[PDB]
Design a protein around this ligand. Structure first.
Ligand SMILES: C[S@@+](CC[C@H](N)C(=O)[O-])C[C@H]1O[C@@H](n2cnc3c(N)ncnc32)[C@H](O)[C@@H]1O
Ligand SMILES: NCc1ccc2c(-c3cccc(C(N)=S)c3)cn(CCO)c2c1
Ligand SMILES: [Zn+2]
Ligand SMILES: [Zn+2]
Ligand SMILES: [Zn+2]
Length: 219
C-alpha cells in the first residue's frame, strides 16, 4: 500500500487561536502517602482522579508516590508500532499486552477553533482521503492534519478497545487515549470516532469488521 502520510511531529499541543483552559479549581485530594516507599498513592478513589483532574506539582499529599500525573509526566506506553492495517491504511498496534483502564498515549496536535478548522477544511484539507481531527471542548478541536504524534494513525472501530478521556492537567484540557479492556500483544488500537472525533461530514466506508458495524465512520 501507499506510504504513510507526512506530519510534523510535536511533543506538546500547539495553541493556534484558542487555549483550552479547564476552569478547574486548584487540585486537592484526601489521599495518604503510603508508608511503603514503593507503593503508589492517588489510586482509584483519589478525589482528583474522580473528576478527571490530574494532581498538580508540589501540592499532592503523596509527593513523588502519586500515580495520577500520567499525562503531564508523558507516561506513554513504549510498545506502540505503526503498521499496515488491512483496508484501513496505517494503524497503531501494541506489541505488549495492555490492561483495562490503562493510559496509553496523549493525542497531540494544533488546538484550533471550529471556525479555524472549517476554514482549513475548505482551503487546505478538501482533497484529503484521510482525516485527522479530534474533538476537545466546546468550539475547539485538535487538528493533527499537519502536526501531531503517532496517535493520529489510530483507526476507528464501531466496537472499540480504547477511548479518549478529557482531563484537566494543570489548568488546561488535554486528551488521552485509555484502554477500555485488556488487549493481547499485536492488537490494533481503536476508538469510536462517533464519540470522540470531529464530524468532518465526509462519508467513508467502515472496515472495522464488527457484526454491528455502522457502515460508515461516525454513522
Ligand atoms: C485519524 S486517520 C487514521 C490513520 C489512517 N488510517 C492513515 O492511514 O493515515 C483516519 C482515517 O483513517 C481511515 N480509517 C480510520 N478508521 C477506519 C475504518 N474503521 N475503516 C476504514 N477506514 C478507516 C479513514 O480514511 C479516516 O479518515
Ligand atoms: N456522528 C458524529 C460523527 C463523528 C465523526 C464523523 C466522521 C469522520 C470520518 C472520518 C474521520 C473523522 C475524523 N474526525 S478523524 C471523522 C464522519 N462523520 C459523518 C459521516 O458519518 C462523522 C460523524
Ligand atoms: Zn489523590
Ligand atoms: Zn496525587
Ligand atoms: Zn464499523
Amino acid at each position: 500500500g501507499a506510504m504513510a502520510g507526512s506530519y510534523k511531529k510535536i511533543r506538546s499541543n500547539v495553541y493556534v487561536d484558542v487555549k483550552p483552559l479547564s476552569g478547574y479549581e486548584a487540585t486537592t485530594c484526601n489521599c495518604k502517602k503510603p508508608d511503603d516507599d514503593t507503593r503508589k498513592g492517588c489510586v482509584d478513589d483519589c478525589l482528583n482522579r474522580m473528576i478527571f483532574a490530574e494532581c498538580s506539582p508540589n501540592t499532592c499529599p503523596c509527593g513523588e508516590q502519586c500515580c495520577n500525573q500520567r499525562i503531564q509526566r508523558h507516561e506513554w506506553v513504549q510498545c506502540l508500532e505503526r503498521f499496515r492495517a488491512e483496508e484501513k491504511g496505517w494503524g497503531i498496534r501494541t506489541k505488549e499486552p495492555l490492561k483495562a483502564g490503562q493510559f496509553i498515549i496523549e493525542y497531540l496536535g494544533e488546538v484550533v477553533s471550529e471556525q479555524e478548522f472549517r476554514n482549513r477544511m475548505i482551503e487546505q484539507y478538501h482533497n484529503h482521503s484521510d482525516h485527522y481531527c479530534l474533538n476537545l471542548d466546546s468550539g475547539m478541536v485538535i487538528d493533527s492534519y499537519r502536526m501531531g504524534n503517532e496517535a493520529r494513525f489510530i483507526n476507528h472501530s464501531c466496537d472499540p478497545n480504547c477511548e479518549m478521556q478529557k482531563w484537566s492537567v494543570n489548568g488546561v484540557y488535554r486528551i488521552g487515549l485509555y484502554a477500555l479492556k485488556d488487549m493481547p500483544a499485536g492488537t490494533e488500537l481503536t476508538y469510536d470516532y462517533n464519540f470522540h472525533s470531529f464530524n468532518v461530514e465526509k462519508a467513508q466506508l467502515c472496515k472495522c469488521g464488527f457484526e454491528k458495524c455502522r457502515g460508515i465512520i461516525g454513522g
